[PDB]
């Protein structure tokens, strides 16, 4: 996260860290959507251009964290994965279209003050909140700059940007399964996700029932916090049918 700030304890109890067993390293962000289901970006697991293709046994999921590098005894919970489900039509070849993946945990995690699932949007919540100008929140342990690494979870609030502006900012082909966010050069505020934030949640707080909903998944950007450039996120609601499906069976 670029131009963000340290997160408060318990501020994002759904934040998950994807951790590589060997070598022990941070892979990506992710989110807890139920006691046994974690949502993340498909590119965190599978991305051939970088020779990345992780299997369940290559990873661990660390839930309830705040410190990026310390094993937080008595607070965080480390889980093993039973199965990984990558969207069948995820396009790693061109624009990361349908960049979404589900991970089923071997055993359910017990919720606590630091571990609690985020809600997935429904038609009306998505309609009402997903509007240009409305702000969302991104969190992660990714790079603090580039285009170093934080000690604790970072957070930044960013406005949703109009589709036309999103398209005109890049050469990459944008689809309906994505949305972009960030401040326009003339707004005088900055902030963006960056390397390492991939797979993390973009959440919004519903003013109707006061719950937090995950609207997006950190997907890609061209240089962290560049004027006239924006971060792109996987449109969670557009891919909700697939999520229900995978959770319905399995």
């Amino acid at each position: 996260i670029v131009e963000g700030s340290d997160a408060e304890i318990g501020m994002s109890p759904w934040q998950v860290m994807l951790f590589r067993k060997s070598p022990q390293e941070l892979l990506c962000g992710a989110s807890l959507i139920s006691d046994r289901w974690v949502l993340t970006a498909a590119h965190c697991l599978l991305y051939p251009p970088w020779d990345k293709n992780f299997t369940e046994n290559d990873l661990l999921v660390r839930i309830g964290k705040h410190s990026r590098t310390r094993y937080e005894r008595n607070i965080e919970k480390i889980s093993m994965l039973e199965k990984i489900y990558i969207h069948p039509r995820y396009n790693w070849r061109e624009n990361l279209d349908r960049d979404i993946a589900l991970m089923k945990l071997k055993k359910p995690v017990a919720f606590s003050d630091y571990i609690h699932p985020v809600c997935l949007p429904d038609r009306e919540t998505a309609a009402s909140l997903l509007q240009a100008g409305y702000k969302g929140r991104v969190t992660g342990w990714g790079n603090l700059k580039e285009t170093g690494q934080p000690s604790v979870l970072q957070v930044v609030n960013l406005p949703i940007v109009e589709r036309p502006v999103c398209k005109d900012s890049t050469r990459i082909r944008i689809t309906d399964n994505m949305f972009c966010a960030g401040y326009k050069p003339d707004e005088g505020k900055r902030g963006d996700a960056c390397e390492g934030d991939s797979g993390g949640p973009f959440v919004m707080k519903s003013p109707f029932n006061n719950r937090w909903y995950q609207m997006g998944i950190v997907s890609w950007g061209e240089g962290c916090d560049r004027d006239g450039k924006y971060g792109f996120y996987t449109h969670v609601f557009r891919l909700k049918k697939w999520i229900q499906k995978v959770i319905d069976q399995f």
């Binding site: 408060e8 304890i9 318990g10 501020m11 109890p13 959507i33 139920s34 006691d35 919720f111 606590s112 003050d113 630091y114 609690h116 699932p117 985020v118 809600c119 909140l129 100008g133 409305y134 702000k135 969302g136 929140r137 957070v155 609030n157 406005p159 919004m204 707080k205 519903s206 003013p207 006061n210 719950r211 937090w212 909903y213």
Partner: peptide, 28 residues
Amino acid sequence: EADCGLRPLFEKKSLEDKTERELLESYI
């Protein structure tokens, strides 16, 4: 889930985090 989106240390105690108002204030 069922009690999703309600944070034990905030919504549940009726405490607000440092910047959530910024989000609510933008939902015009």
